[PDB]
Amino acid sequence: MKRIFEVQPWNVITHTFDPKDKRLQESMTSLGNGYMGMRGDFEEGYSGDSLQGIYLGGVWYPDKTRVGWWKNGYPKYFGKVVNAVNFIKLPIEINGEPVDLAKDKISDFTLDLDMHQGVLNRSFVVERGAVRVALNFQRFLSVAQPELSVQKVTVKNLSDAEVDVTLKPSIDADVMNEEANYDERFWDVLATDQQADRGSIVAKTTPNPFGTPRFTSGMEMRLVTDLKNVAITQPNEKEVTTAYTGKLAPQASAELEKRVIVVTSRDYDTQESLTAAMHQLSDKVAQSSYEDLLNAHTAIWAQRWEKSDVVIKGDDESQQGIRFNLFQLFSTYYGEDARLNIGPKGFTGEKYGGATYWDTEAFAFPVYLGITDPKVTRNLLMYRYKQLDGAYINAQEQGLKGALFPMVTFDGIECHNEWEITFEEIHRNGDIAFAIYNYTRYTGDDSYVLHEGAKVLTEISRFWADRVHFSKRNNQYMIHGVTGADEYENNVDNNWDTNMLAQWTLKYTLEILGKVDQDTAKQLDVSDEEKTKWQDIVDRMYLPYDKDLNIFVQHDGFLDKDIEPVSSIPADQRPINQNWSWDKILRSPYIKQGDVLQGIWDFIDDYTPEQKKANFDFYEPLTVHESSLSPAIHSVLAADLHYEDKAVELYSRTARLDLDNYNNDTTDGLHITSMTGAWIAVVQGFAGMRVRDGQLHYAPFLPKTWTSYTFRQVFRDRLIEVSVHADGPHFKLLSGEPLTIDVAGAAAAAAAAA
């Protein structure tokens, strides 16, 4: 829809500043180190339209549920990551007047996100008539020191006369979540400390009646500068500040570094110990130079790129896309904290609350299995196991047995508040179970599924067994009143994907129960009566199908709709979520994202080329891709069917979803969980990567518009590099023991230095 940044291989940079595209711009320039993250907000302040957003991983608030009308079973709160105390604040005054790009005239603007070093640069000249001052910013959230945020500002007087410049590094707790249900603050300041060269604020989320955890943050600022310190009084009980000034001669420069340490109660047991660590880490960092801190940061990012960069030659728009995805994906989550997960919009916005969704096991798993240690995904599996208690509660809220994993959660308990989604989008249980299988197949490690995983599969199967009903009229089991992955169909009957996933879950669990050891089988305690019941459900599950079209019907009665292609929809009416009333969206034949195709994608090798063709040709043209998680899987499926041009088109739609604002909603933040798309399209799609009966298989094709593409993949303790050129694919074993892979049907042995 709109591309506000230039195209470059390693940078997302622009020389244009427009107040009208501020939120979009802030989203694109977000940063993160897994421990915390934030939007590309201007630290000196900005009075125009903007979304202030800084988020601490795992730090959320239980916002009391807000709905028009209540329904029995609805959750009591919507957990959402808290917009944190503003610790980057650093107003800049020129001759006493603060800089504010919403009002100031500027020249020579540059906003540059350096993806290779993981740093955000921004520079411009403040144009105030005869008074002209250049400002150069650079900052980063250290991947070397998780609690560390580093900012640097360089000032240069371009005027013909002396000018006064004053920087006021500070910490401001007067913040709020724009999406708060009742327009109320979530932070209470516990302690503030202001000195000549330091400042710190210890805050704690306000109390709640839901018995959920309250979080304490400790933020301390330390400085490095050649400016003169000035006395300043603490402005409020919710803000601490310092002041440094300098009378710059023409062409003279000054600079200041702001080092902020951020600690939270999830890593320290008491306010006292938390406060102590805050001070100790600050003392430690004050011993390091800017270069020291930066190099340690860049060295780690360089290492990450070394292991997982995707080099595309001949198409920079595509190069920039894949690198932006992986950059923001890893900035959000790199498996460093086993307690965390991946919020849909990571640390770049508020929508969805940064909570845990089915996005993780459906779309994130494929990528983390491919480029990170298998222990990362194994832990994402345990994350759910550890929340089984909450799943039992969710199911009970709907009068169902077994485990019902939530649509939205932080502790296992449901958070979403829409009956069509909260109670009915149950396919998620199936996606959760599939992730277990996917991890097991990929890694060859069945120690999880034969233990903790068996319990999760058992309880999910228990849910399915209680949720289906037997239709005497059809002598088959059915699943009425649901919402499939395609959220543009609500409260429908026999959503194919859901029935398929339920049947598969039961089938797989029965397989696993036959493999666990006696002690485990005893604990699971699944009677022969249960197994017989489950087997009957597997045997007689109803699956809608249409002979004439040879397709699986999304849900019963789908073909009764007024079927017409997406091409018939006027461009000015798209996206339909922003232009049509909900009833119109629901009854129309338009699909939000993969549903039948999501199922086929999960079980891509279980369907024949003809079946896949029939379903793809029918559904793809009806899909509006209004979920960022839609384009990528469609690209893979297209590649699978040899629709090379369509695959590349879809690749661009996912790889550059945010960069080109495809869904006209990047103003709300980046589609982080969707950042998995480009990699999937390139590897599973273009390269045709599949894991079959324990061995890696590829069958690559090269986008006609490309010279080549190279990527690295982690597979059972081996690190492989795949390079695709016009003359065919090329493989190199970078590490690990000799491995035999399948390439278009030919077995090739890989060995180091050979």
Return the structure tokens found at 306.
């070394």
Does 635 bind K ion (CB under 5 A)? Our answer is no
Does 490 bind K ion (CB under 5 A)? Our answer is no
Does 545 bind a second copy (CB under 8 A)? Our answer is no
Does 580 bind a second copy (CB under 8 A)? Our answer is yes
Residue in the block written with tokens 């020129």: 94
Which residues make Cβ contacts (< 8 Å) with residue 304, sequence separation at least 6? 143, 330, 334
Nearer to a second copy, 382 or 586 (CB): 586
Give the binding range for a second copy (CB under 8 A) out of 69-77, 121-129, 525-533, 726-734.
69-77
Determine which residue in the list 352, 488, 552, 715 makes contact with K ion, applying CB under 5 A.
Answer: 488
Nearer to K ion, 145 or 490 (CB): 490
Does 419 bind a second copy (CB under 8 A)? Our answer is yes
Nearer to K ion, 319 or 588 (CB): 588
Residue pair 310/326 in contact by the 8 Å Cβ criterion: yes
Min dist. Cβ of residue 600 to a second copy (A): 23
Does 69 bind a second copy (CB under 8 A)? Our answer is yes
CA distance 674 to 733: 29
Does 619 bind K ion (CB under 5 A)? Our answer is no
Q: List the catalytic residue out of 43, 44, 361, 487.
A: 487
Peptide linkage before 169 cis (omega within 30 of 0): no
CA distance 625 to 486: 10
Q: Is the dihedral of CA 40, 44, 49, 53 positive or negative?
A: positive
Return the structure tokens found at 739.
């491995």
Q: Give the x/- contact pattern for a second copy in 438-477, rule: CB under 8 A.
A: -------------------------------xxxxxx---
Min dist. Cβ of residue 470 to a second copy (A): 7
Determine which residue in the list 360, 458, 588, 713 makes contact with K ion, applying CB under 5 A.
Answer: 588
Return the structure tokens found at 446.
């069945």
Determine which residue in the list 1, 49, 67, 105 makes contact with a second copy, applying CB under 8 A.
Answer: 67
Nearer to a second copy, 217 or 398 (CB): 398
Determine which residue in the list 104, 174, 179, 556 makes contact with a second copy, applying CB under 8 A.
Answer: 556
**What residues does 188 pair with on adjacent strands?**
204
Return the structure tokens found at 158.
């371009």
CB hemisphere CA count around 718 (13 angstroms): 21
Does 490 bind a second copy (CB under 8 A)? Our answer is yes
Helix (H) or strand (E) holding 653: helix 644-655
Does 582 bind a second copy (CB under 8 A)? Our answer is yes
Q: Which does 481 bind (CB under 5 to 8 A by kind): a second copy, K ion, none?
A: a second copy
Nearer to a second copy, 2 or 66 (CB): 66
Does 480 bind a second copy (CB under 8 A)? Our answer is yes
Min dist. Cβ of residue 426 to K ion (A): 17
Determine which residue in the list 2, 15, 66, 515 makes contact with a second copy, applying CB under 8 A.
Answer: 66
Which residues make Cβ contacts (< 8 Å) with residue 360, sequence separation at least 6? 341, 342, 380, 435, 673
Tell me the three state secondary structure of residue 678: helix
Min dist. Cβ of residue 568 to a second copy (A): 13
Return the structure tokens found at 380.
């994402």
C-alpha distance from residue 410 to each of 59, 134, 306, 418 (Å): 9, 44, 33, 18
Total count of residues recorded for the chain: 754
Return the structure tokens found at 660.
């080109």
Residue pair 666/26 in contact by the 8 Å Cβ criterion: no
Does 419 bind K ion (CB under 5 A)? Our answer is no
Please confirm, yes or no, whether 424 is among the known catalytic residues: no
Residues 236-265 that bind a second copy (CB under 8 A): none
Give the binding range for a second copy (CB under 8 A) out of 66-74, 190-198, 299-307, 648-656.
66-74
Q: Which does 488 bind (CB under 5 to 8 A by kind): K ion, a second copy, none?
A: K ion
Helix (H) or strand (E) holding 273: helix 271-285
One-letter amino acid for residue 237 of the chain: E
One-letter amino acid for residue 216 of the chain: T
C-alpha distance from residue 621 to each of 113, 340, 418, 575, 625 (Å): 36, 37, 29, 15, 10
Q: Give the binding site for K ion (CB under 5 A).
A: 488, 588, 590
Query: Under the rule (CB under 8 A), what is the footprint of a second copy?
Result: 65-69, 71-73, 397-399, 417-419, 423-424, 469-474, 478, 480-481, 490-494, 556-557, 559-563, 577-584, 586-587
Active site amino acids? 487
